[PDB]
Design a binder for this molecule. Structure first.
Ligand SMILES: Cc1ncc(COP(=O)(O)O)c(CNC(CCC(=O)O)C(=O)O)c1O
Ligand SMILES: Cc1ncc(COP(=O)(O)O)c(CNC(CCC(=O)O)C(=O)O)c1O
Ligand SMILES: Cc1ncc(COP(=O)(O)O)c(CNC(CCC(=O)O)C(=O)O)c1O
Ligand SMILES: Cc1ncc(COP(=O)(O)O)c(CNC(CCC(=O)O)C(=O)O)c1O
Ligand SMILES: Cc1ncc(COP(=O)(O)O)c(CNC(CCC(=O)O)C(=O)O)c1O
Ligand SMILES: Cc1ncc(COP(=O)(O)O)c(CNC(CCC(=O)O)C(=O)O)c1O
Lengths: 304, 304, 304, 304, 304, 304
């Protein structure tokens, strides 16, 4: 937790950041949000692919026509502002744009405005203390990801997560660390809160957005790092069983970073440990914050 | 609006009913809710199909495994309690069960509890002041309803409504009063916040739940009233074009009650006015609150 | 062929009934049509379910918003007029409403009118001189019927038949008399030019319109006749293999009347002949024109 | 209109180019056609990708097994002839091969032949006088494109256009200039009479033929011009929402040439004007008719 | 195991019932089989719905065109013989028709014949010693049932069971007793080796064959017993979540007879024990073997 | 046929290699197998891509969790052993891993083991003595391939072939030599027993595994050979009609090697003969056994 939360421009004490129970988003899933990480690097506290995240936040809101009064630059400034205000050097940031207290009825009244929050706070490995190192055990879920043209899966919206709750909770109830969901066609989509990658014969594979997968920013970074490392990348639909035949499997995400998947549905992947290509990518990723990996794309935004 | 809102057992002043901005449901659409109407009848203030609604609220929570500490009877008592406390004789009630301030991450921590709210307040015709009388103009949306086995459509959950927002807002932007959505198969599903009925050759038609339609309680009541009136009812999949060939078309819902649809995509239905069968059902429905229609199923719960 | 064709309100000799090659319908399938039969009866020449066919014609046009200047009564008089002008007592009637010479570009110019033709002529059994009596060999096509919400299959429009051509020609090229098509879901739809019926344990089955089957008027009469005969009817989705397990199988249509199907894909149906139930239904149908079957629905329109 | 139309090997006068009202294609949509443009250029009148179009015309007929007695070069010579004979230096050409007066019944009799017509005439911007410059407002339709294996969308056949009528008329009735359709999967297919392109981060995107999109000749030309300009091209499935996130959006076609799309469903694309990449491509395209763009592929067939 | 097995017309000893390892069915899953139970009753040993099973065995072979040289009565006599010869009064019978040693290559050579085997042996409760009484815990599988028109699910064929292996083994590995599978549409199909029934508000529900469910003989018997008891039955598509909302849930099958399902995916069904309606049906079922339930349909074939 | 068959570690004379009729695989399609060819070469007898085939065998088993006691090296030695024991220099090898006599009930008892067979024998061209040289006539089947996530199509398992039987037998009954199946989406999948390739404008196309196509080892070698030849390869979804527009079409498989397809559904492909590109590829393939083609990948395993 932390001392302050940026709320519609103001730095509000954490406990005072409250909204009415009749706020639209509590009843209709009408909000869009982001996950952003601030790392303690060789260059000091830096926000990873900051602009990319605020840009996606805007894109998500645009799809639903949620009015956003803050520009991308102003959102970035607020983000850096809230990190410094809480005196954090590393943290997870949660920007949230939502339809507030505007009356009942799924359709908000014409002229309404959205409320915006940006909370920063320390947050450990999404999948566990040993996850990044030893990998996790995944399970293919019995629940499928949203079908195309129902609820936009390119958008990171609150309502989307009922699905992730069903997928993620099932895996956990059965003793697994994360669930992998298939789209409505029976092909691999993504993890409950991560994108899915496969490594086969030295080539990196990952499903396209049209497989109902979120256009992950970690995913995109990985694809770019891989090309820098001379690793071929193929964005293509993947069969459910490809998970059992792949040489390596790993998940990506802002919270999950790069987490090796050592088994799927109880079937061991490779030697049951982090794969060689997964390790190259993982080191190349965390090397961005030690200076070992040259930031050629401009992904480290100085907090100050 | 009103003076009080029932909140976790307590009667809280409306303006004091607030939750933290880090409440789970604001970020992940993790809530289930209901729409219930209290009518000023010949028997005094009565809650229409009260138990049925609280039962559905419980069912929705069960599907997502949201822990609910209140029993159906206790929820009903709270509902009647909040109506009387606000001294209302007619009103719309909004029970809401949601995952509150329990930490970030789509999967709530083991042992967590849900927060529950029940707000009562006057609310007019969902589709307009002239809707019930003259009917409304509907449009078939370009957005489809959630596919089976993605997010349960039998559950009335907050996250579901991103879809209803897209469907409903599109119709309104194009000058229509409500949008009718098709499921992922191209068949009629339901309205953004209503169930859809068709009348053809004296027979009543409506899509099954498997057409991604909510198991409406108004819908169910209509099917029962129709059988009492000697009207044949067929719950079956319906083609998109059946809307243009039906003799009558109408939508049903707690907020929308029974609203005639005089046109679809600009094509006039019948004489462009309330249809004869729609009128019989509408009169039989509102007759429940004047004593004209005998309450044979026990649908009027006395508020007191 | 015959001597005269009703063309926009006037009797034109057959040979002079022509249209410009830049007629819309020739380039964009923009026409709707019907198939009607006139039968010799105890009441003299009678058109079978005349009004129902003209109503469907009107419905097909309505779906595409093709403006139709003729009323249903006017089209009915014109049809009876062409039957008499050609000195026919029995015949096949082909009404055709089509977008004419209005310019290129799929969307016709505002304020356009449609051209209308009604040709009547003798036409033998749709599937053969021995079809009604001995049955036919059918084949399940490798081409599927139009998917829901692409082109309305409840409409009888010209453009629809490219599919019928693919399905029908494939059956014929492989040695069969007619093809049966499956919908995009893999279930039985209809024949290239007729509806499909199955008989099993004394019960009659036929796919609903949502299985991409045209709402056949013959189909409808058979269902109504069957109920009179005390035969149970079930309109439901049917599996492809149900064709091989049915006790009987037959096709219905204005042109094909009631044609038994002795085999499907080379697999013999029942004894390989017109089954007993198909027989009961066929005698009841043709009985309408002898008076042996009472015309309880008012299906025989006298030509005079 | 013009003065001559090529009709079955002979240059007949416009007013004489007629066929019987009982012509097959008028009742069953059994025709295949093309759209070709003749441009006035720095080299006089030139037919754009003349052979390619006549080849597709042949390909379309082949899929439906429509017999074609003319060779590609004879059609090309006839086309060139119609342009000259009518004294046009810029025009739109419409070759049409159709099943004519061969008798009723969807299956044409063995040994029949097709009638062939080729009309040429002046035709302006398909989507408006200001289209090419300012861009147009597009709408995603509520009607879907033909599903795979129903009616081959690889072929340009008359019957295909009932769908294009529904898609295009809907957008026009709602105040847009063109409608974009999704396939039965919920992915972007194509415009009612154009192919769809998106530009994102400098890369050009367009759906594959398997997304129920016609293998456009303008589309193919653009892909080739793009690569020549060093612009990366990706033929891949695209989500419905990608239309709101693309930096640029444009439609391609013979009639529509290269038309920018400044907004989709009311959501502004980029700056609301022609984007930079669409600009380069459009200039390269029209540069062919001035010599500025070297015709490296031989896409210009001099009329003479 | 037992002492004799009927093999191609002769009662061979168990140990001699062998076929070559190059038998077609061993490599291509080309066999059709059945499951039948012989019960000890108030009338001695009786084979339940004996003829029905042998008829389905024939139907299965017919779909795949496997030649069967034995008539239904010869199979019935052989079955009765195997039971007697082995001195059993209660047992499980397994008739199996398979393509034997006819050479490699999926297509058997013209004129081949099938090998037929019929083994009888004592087999207890399919889902456990406590199944029938206490009910079992079911799990919805992550594997889907065969899609329509791929491998006919109306037939009980060997190859079909790779799917049942995946569905059933997954539930068992996760600590459940049986897995319930959804079809490719996301709707309930059937258990890995049983049909699925739900009870809601006194009405009995079960998916149709078109939901990729086998036309179970126990299922059919239950529908008939239900109607006799005045219980309404609805054969209709069912949503995945309906399993959590049903008042009662149970599985049917020859091996599993009538087994209550006390929980699905860990969610308790009703009171967590056999429900009242499942109770009535189960008693009516087993009442057949005591005389309590009058065999009104002739489902008991005395062994003698 | 031959003299000996490797059976669980020992050479058994062909005639004595038998199994009990209660062997699991005979009743539930529970086996996985391979097809391998041994060729006479300049290096003497050589098994083509031997290890790759045994690896796939292992992969097929892994997917179903069938326990396999033999290592890949052990299976390879056994295969070479049976080739020599039978005095063969060229031959077809059939390894078969199957669940044996372990009891009835789809789920085998914990701790079970699988039986393994490896038969080697001479086998002529899969599709005919003139197939490789003159090509074959193919037919698009009316039966579709297994849907994703039902039965893994990446596996070569016995149960899979019920589908291959339906597709292959249908082509053969209608006068063709092989059938081509479409997946549940309506796109080209593969032949009943081989992968499908198309050639268009010098580019080679073939469906990905997600089109329900087996990851053919011949397919893989052709793609690798093609790249050596400087031929561009595109693994992508293909439309059904693309078969009629391709310049060339051929099938690949261990048994069928490289078989040109001269016609599809009676529509001639190219000149009606082995196209030039198919030719280049075919000569490169067979060149491997003459040495004319350098074995750069290590595909020739010497039998010795
Ligand atoms: C469904 C889903 N897919 C993929 C991703 C990966 O996208 P990135 O852009 O690379 O982050 C996320 C991010 N999800 C989370 C945590 C979700 C939660 O709040 O539980 C994250 O990494 O912030 C996600 O929710
Ligand atoms: C998608 C949807 N379908 C059908 C219905 C009809 O169900 P009933 O049980 O008969 O009510 C509702 C209820 N929706 C609303 C209002 C939604 C909103 O809050 O905007 C109602 O009638 O309370 C709904 O949201
Ligand atoms: C696809 C199709 N399905 C069903 C029917 C049956 O409907 P009825 O209303 O009972 O006629 C027809 C009528 N087809 C034809 C002949 C088609 C042709 O002209 O080739 C008819 O009976 O007039 C049809 O074309
Ligand atoms: C559905 C459709 N998609 C794409 C295209 C684009 O293909 P091009 O090869 O690049 O032309 C066309 C051509 N349609 C038209 C106009 C349709 C009409 O006749 O109204 C054309 O450009 O001639 C089309 O009809
Ligand atoms: C997939 C499947 N569904 C339903 C049924 C139920 O049909 P009934 O006709 O009522 O039996 C069975 C029969 N299966 C088994 C056992 C399967 C096995 O061999 O393990 C049976 O009851 O013999 C089945 O295999
Ligand atoms: C469905 C299927 N697809 C593709 C292939 C091609 O894969 P390859 O790895 O290149 O062999 C085969 C192999 N089938 C056979 C023969 C099947 C039969 O036994 O009838 C083969 O080539 O051994 C197959 O069965």
């Amino acid at each position: 937790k932390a001392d302050y939360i940026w709320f519609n421009g103001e730095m509000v004490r954490w406990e005072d950041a409250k909204v009415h129970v009749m706020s639209h988003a509590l009843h209709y899933g009408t909000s869009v949000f982001e996950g952003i990480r601030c790392y303690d690097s060789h260059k000091g506290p830096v926000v990873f692919r900051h602009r990319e995240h605020m840009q996606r936040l805007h894109d998500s809101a645009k799809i639903y026509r949620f009015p956003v009064s803050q520009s991308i630059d102003e959102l970035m400034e607020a983000c850096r502002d809230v990190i410094r205000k809480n005196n954090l050097t590393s943290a997870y940031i949660r920007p949230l744009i939502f339809v507030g207290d505007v009356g009942m009825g799924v359709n908000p009244p014409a002229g309404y405005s959205t409320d915006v929050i940006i909370a920063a706070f320390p947050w450990g490995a999404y999948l566990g203390a040993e996850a990044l190192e030893q990998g996790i055990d995944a399970m293919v879920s019995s629940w499928n990801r949203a079908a195309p043209n129902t609820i936009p899966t390119a958008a990171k919206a609150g309502g989307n997560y009922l699905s992730s709750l069903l997928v993620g909770s099932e895996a956990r109830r059965h003793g697994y660390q994360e669930g992998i969901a298939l789209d409505v066609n029976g092909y691999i989509s993504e993890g409950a809160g991560e994108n899915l990658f496969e490594v086969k014969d030295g080539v990196l594979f990952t499903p396209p957005f049209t497989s109902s997968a979120l256009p992950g920013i970690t995913r995109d970074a990985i694809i770019k790092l891989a090309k820098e490392l001379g690793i071929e990348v193929r964005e293509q639909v993947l069969s459910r069983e490809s998970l059992y035949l792949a040489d390596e499997v790993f998940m990506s995400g802002t919270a999950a970073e790069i987490t090796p998947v050592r088994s799927v549905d109880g079937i061991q992947v490779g030697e049951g440990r982090c794969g060689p290509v997964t390790k190259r990518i993982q080191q190349a990723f965390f090397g961005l914050f030690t200076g070992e990996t040259e930031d050629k794309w401009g992904w480290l935004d100085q907090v100050n």
